[PDB]
Design a binder for this molecule. Structure first.
Ligand code: ADN
Ligand code: ADN
Ligand code: ADN
Lengths: 229, 231, 229, 231, 229, 231
């Protein structure tokens, strides 16, 4: 695959997808045993290790629909990946989404044109694989890890209009990857889920503290890993 | 309200929404105790009864986004309805979607322009209330009712020469109906809880039909799951 | 046909299309001789009787483009109907549309996506069959029944934006069916017309009285029936 | 106004709008008494004369929505024109539309973005003033001029590889031209009366051409109907 | 060709395209030797003469995308034209565009639907032929003729919204033809350029004087002619 | 700024923008004197050095409109960057576009919805700053570096089953990449100067690949033109 420097058999059937390749390194080095780096192409690191006997890969995606679409498509078509789990942050857009909540995205809205390019007059609604979702939910509920299940918004432009309106329709937060993941996974018959923590409140400008972030990042990765193994 | 002839207090917190008002009569009379008809306007019948210590209402919605939108808006704004559960059918668009499966719709695609009118360049993904969806899932699992959780397509044209159900199937979409996008959107807008529970009435892309007996089974399974889920 | 329980030959070549199936029953029972009910499917009643020797059917359509599209398509493809006349109400959006005017719709604007689904970048303008229209107009003018001829708006959402703008372009009123009727009739080479009365003024909130409604409903049905026979 | 060099009072209440300014000269000089040319700007000629006790003006519009929009806007806003009647040709897109038929356009479809720019998610259907359309119909019937009443397609691209005239024909659309949507929209916006009367110059979907003599006949029939309709 | 009354060989390989056919006559009669008029169809004059040995044609286009599209398509397909140069005016939309600047359009934005009809979900960006552009630029710079190189807006509706926004994105001015010229030329592998003078400032309402217009019109035609010969 | 960990004064006026942060390291270390790395956030490296008496910065942008938009916005708004030059590759979509040609993008088409979100019914054509484009052209000509000036297509989907690169090629579009529309749009919005200089990495519509040696040559030619153009 053009953007991934891996040999046959170097990437697991289950891949965690953080946006930041340095966070990919962090997750692998912190949570996994017998870690190997199978990709340094573009400095977008991919690693493979084991977690409680299960082979797991962790692959940086970059930011935005186009960047994640590249890596998801190559992981699927070139490396036969089956389960794809984004582990990221989002900006919360409602006050009832709390700083410690781990969010499981059922679906995502978008202003990306990726689907209108495919479907024209059809509004395509991306969907998480329910088995992965319910396994993640059960993993959180098993521990007492606070979890909220709803929809997100996949934005094409980091730097406001209608986020305001989307919040009024109960949308939980904004990030830049989920629509692409969910759509491409489903198109190839693979399983996908996006697990998200809150990096801030965008409407009130209320940031989260570094300590709060460290805790929720742990809960997120633990949920991702517990649910597949 | 203009389309529902009910006095305040006649409609329950929790409302099942078949498309067919004759099916609403059937549901209410078969499953519920001490049933009153509260609406006869346009023959779009609505009934209220009790199921295991709880008020349940059953309101026909009619067919298509605009029709169900009217009923859902009025139920929410004039009758303070909290929980809205569509109980209906869809045409399966994948072979792997079996005739016995009860479908729980996480989300719905659409060719309705209802959301584009509101959202412009935003593809709005409508979303089921997860609490209701999980309760329905659990109640199916409790009984062993076969269940599949995924997305549907909310079509504006039952008969469509320009149909892209072929493409939507390749993206894993389970089935086609005509109401869900509207239900999910309008409930979410007013902070109310919504879910669509669907049976399969045929496979659109093979033409293949289900038997009358098969439809009876799965309808029962669907209403059972629906009522047990809200207790 | 899936949604219509009629035997071969039970439905006339000319069908009146009220939205309300109870109004379908009312029209049939009040205006027609030797009435039979050929459809109770979904409680969306269809009846056939005679008016001055001519066989006439009256079929409920329900509300909205999708619902009428079903019944029009089945009446055309399964029952070979030739002339399709909607008899309904609309909300008037201009002050010069009076409470007693019977409206004949030449065409209709819409926010339904039904045509953009078919035509993409093309704005399709639905058109009434002129023969039916001119026959209706002549029937009204013959009696002195007040009639206004122009365009309407076919709305997808009963519960404002741009109705305001449409009024400024001379559009007469708002209803929820005409675009579908006109488009599907023309597509199958059949004849269609929508005859409408005023249920209220939407911009001023000015309602019509029950007596005013009863009179105009009579004038509308009499025009529909006089023009085909 | 910027595109019409007329002084106030030189333009009549009632204006015929050929696309071709040389045809405007022909109409005015052949049919009208005591004719003045009131505009030479861009060679888009405009003439005023009399027909049976009434002032009539004849203004070339040029080709396409943007061009006719300029003339129509200026005629309305600067010259208080009340009645605007396009007299022109279209290509037939159906076999059942005959070369001798004068077309009266009830409405027009378009691939122009002019209305989407204004109306967003609304498909605006432009509409002829019924009084003018009925007067034209009556004047044709009075003479036995063959007439067909229906819709046309207002195209932005005379030459179009991506053309959907095939589909528009299956929906009963009669013919293709390049002006009507603009005329009908802009007149309606300013509360003025508009109508397009059209002859058939060929069948686009067979390629088949009309003779010069056939075009002469039908042009006469069209102008006759037009002038007799306004008396 | 339907709209052009020319015999084979009457139109040069290089055509100047003013919007006004009277300006076509003016340019030909003033700048060219041995002038012939090859087209009077619709009074949309086309002329052919010589400039310093080079055969040159000057063809009126009319106003708007549809009108220019007709003449460009026939000049290309029926008369094999190679180089097509619009010589027109635009309304300047920025204060830094001066009344004496000759504008060379690199590209143009539009609210014409012509390209969305072709490309659907794609924003097509029309492009001037760089060879013609750079030759024009060098011709101006050779003389000291003031020249500004950027983008324009091709409007479908002479009689405001977003012109305001387009100015903020550095767009220079508004006219009604360039998108069509650039798109159709490129589609047929031919060379196109639009050279423009300022007829006024649209935002401040500041008009140019007749003398200023006469000077810039001369500079524009001289640049068009000098650059091809 | 949130994505760039630089203190004020560490980023130059003039910034080269490769997509690949490892290529930014390569450019800065190969071509520049006294280089500092000013950013390590997300491993999207950014370097500042000197070239012939001028500060030059080299910042990885990542792949696609949303990614480069973040970097470009932050460079402009937080670091007062004046000149932004993308140095990268594209896939050729025409046979007449040769592997050795350095491309200077006058404008870019896109299937990104970024401008439609802003502009509605307007097709926004983004535009290179002509001064920068002309300086690059001149510096290529000064050396005899083969150069082609034209448009590209900025794609949202590297892998696209619904691709219209076939049609875009017939309109003379030279090549496909994933960044230019964003660069040109956002620079123009903030009154800054932008240009994209591109090498060809293969022909997408024949499949045909360039050699490693050919890619080395043309990369050198591109960076040479880029640095010589800003002096
Ligand atoms: N194949 C199908 N296509 C569309 N709607 C269907 C189908 N099967 C069942 N339905 C549902 O049944 C109704 C019409 O019979 C629609 O409201 C729709 O919701
Ligand atoms: N086949 C046709 N296609 C498009 N326009 C036509 C056709 N026939 C006649 N016209 C009219 O004639 C003009 C161009 O000759 C256009 O303005 C258009 O209004
Ligand atoms: N054929 C191609 N299609 C899309 N992007 C390409 C191609 N060749 C090079 N690129 C550029 O390289 C990057 C991905 O390798 C993209 O950011 C894009 O800008």
């Amino acid at each position: 695959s053009v953007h991934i420097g891996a040999e046959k058999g170097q990437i697991a059937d289950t891949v965690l997808l953080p946006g930041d390749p340095l966070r990919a390194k962090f997750i692998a080095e912190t949570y996994l045993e017998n870690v190997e780096c199978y990709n340094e192409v573009r400095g977008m690191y991919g690693f493979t290790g084991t977690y409680k006997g299960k082979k797991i890969s962790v692959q940086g995606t970059g930011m935005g629909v186009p960047s994640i679409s590249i890596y998801v498509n190559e992981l699927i078509q070139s490396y036969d990946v089956q389960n794809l789990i984004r582990v990221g942050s989002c900006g919360a857009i409602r006050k009832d989404v709390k700083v410690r909540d781990v969010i499981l995205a059922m679906t995502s809205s978008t202003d990306s044109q990726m689907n209108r390019v495919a479907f024209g007059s059809v509004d395509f609604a991306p969907c998480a694989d329910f088995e992965l979702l319910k396994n993640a939910y059960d993993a959180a509920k098993d521990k007492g890890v606070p979890v909220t299940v709803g929809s997100v918004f996949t934005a094409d432009q980091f730097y406001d209009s209608q986020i305001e309106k989307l919040a009024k329709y109960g949308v939980l937060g904004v990030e830049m990857e989920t629509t692409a993941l969910y759509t491409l996974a489903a198109k190839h018959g693979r399983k996908a889920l996006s697990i998200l923590t809150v990096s801030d409140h965008v409407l009130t400008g209320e940031e989260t503290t570094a300590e709060e972030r460290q805790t929720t990042f742990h809960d997120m990765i633990d949920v991702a890993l517990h649910s597949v193994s």
